[PDB]
Design a protein around this ligand. Structure first.
Ligand SMILES: Nc1ccccc1CO
Ligand SMILES: Nc1ccccc1CO
Lengths: 263, 265
């Protein structure tokens, strides 16, 4: 993996591994979400970072507020997939990171993703909103002109997700993260929430459908010693509404929507 | 990745990924166990397997894991390159054995090694059977004729008998269920998930102040997609030793048993 010629985006090629594929012999959406996380990690490292020099002083971190992923074709075990990523400023609101998944052999676009990131104090978890001085540090690594993975005005990535009302049509209760679900800072990985959201999807839907779109909002972090409840309701191609909440009190940690197509 | 010059072993280099490391900034034992599984899958594919042969597919016979022993000297950090060399070996009518050697790509030193025992079984009836002569001829051409052991030692800890954990267990992790990410392409619980479940009962205090050096894990029964597991641990000892037991939360049917060894940082 390396940065592109202009240095305003990073590219990396991945070979799909045996343990990374599902029952349909193609890579899972969690494997794709892991490769997006990995390519973004190396892009940050290649430009010296995704905390900055100013951020580390005031205990500031970049957190995920929304993840939208659209897949056209899932790479089979053995295939090579090239992902191009890049960050972009969104004023005082935060930072946006986009991805383009391509076939290494044909060069066609087989998927695309977009994520909204917000500024937060690691210790108090307060929003704070992107401040002066710290914005100019990373603006130099972003294309000055708009480069959107989802350019279409008023599209799926910018839609408002409603809260699932009870009773949910489907549910997966008592979901706890393990040590493999935690990262280097002992926090639950952002991809585990995606796997938890799809646990409430009925097995029959999975077996007769392919996941085309997934939009997932991040409201609260699930701790290592927390238990999650996954809820789903058909709102329709098949569309579903999702809700992740704490098993006890019922505090909302995530909400989202998925879209599936017939095979 | 490619086979070696003689074609009696396969080599593959992996770069350690960000999501593959633990709290120590180094790759986890589950990441290592995944790379061992992946290098073995490509070695089988490079010599025309799927790891079933022509005769095994015809009789509905599969290769199952009966034991996995892994010893790590150094865990590769995020960014480091690790070269793994694997090879299969015939163990007569008992079954086959597969070994691994983990090396540093920069220095070339051995940073870990693994060994696994595999047994012949009927895919449908789940009944174990002895390896027939006609099957043994089909895979022996891809194995070194002379013994090549990753753990050659006179008294190595890979061939030791593991006892059954008696109740009450010192530590426990109750209500463990596999998810879709824990299943493979045939909807079976991945062999690495059992390792992660075994280490869930290890206290967080031990993990934070120790590094996992050895892990021996016996496979007795497969955990279904709709099954719930209970993980049990008891200290049996600078070095810390533990006894482990995975069983169904309900009836208490044993699915796994093993031992781990940890050293002080
Ligand atoms: N942001 C985000 C959210 C979910 C999954 C993966 C990523 C990449 O970091
Ligand atoms: N054999 C075995 C056992 C446990 C984990 C991984 C492997 C490799 O397939």
């Amino acid at each position: 993996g390396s940065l592109t010629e202009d240095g305003l985006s990073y590219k990396e090629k991945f070979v799909v591994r045996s343990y990374e594929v599902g029952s349909n012999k193609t890579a899972t959406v969690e494997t794709i979400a892991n490769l997006l996380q990995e390519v973004g990690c190396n892009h940050a490292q290649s430009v010296g970072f995704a905390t900055t020099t100013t951020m580390r002083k005031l205990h500031l971190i970049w957190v995920t507020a929304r993840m939208h992923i659209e897949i056209y074709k899932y790479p089979a075990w053995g295939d090579v997939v090239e992902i191009e990523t890049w960050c972009q400023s969104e004023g005082r609101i935060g930072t946006r990171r986009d991805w383009i998944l391509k076939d290494s052999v044909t060069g066609e676009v087989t998927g695309r993703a977009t994520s909204k990131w917000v500024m937060m104090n690691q210790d108090t978890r307060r929003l704070q909103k992107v401040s002066d001085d710290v914005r100019d540090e990373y603006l130099v690594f972003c294309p000055q002109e708009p480069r959107l993975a989802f350019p279409e005005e008023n599209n799926r990535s910018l839609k408002k997700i409603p809260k699932l009302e009870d009773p949910a049509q489907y549910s997966m209760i008592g979901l706890k993260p393990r040590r493999a679900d935690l990262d280097m800072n002992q926090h639950v990985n952002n991809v585990t929430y995606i796997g938890w959201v799809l646990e409430s999807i009925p097995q029959e839907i999975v077996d007769t459908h392919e996941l085309q779109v997934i939009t997932l909002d991040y409201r609260r972090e699930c701790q290592q010693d927390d238990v999650v409840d996954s809820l789903t309701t058909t709102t329709s191609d098949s569309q579903f509404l999702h809700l992740l909440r704490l098993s006890g009190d019922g505090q909302e940690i995530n909400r989202g929507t998925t879209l599936w197509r017939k095979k």
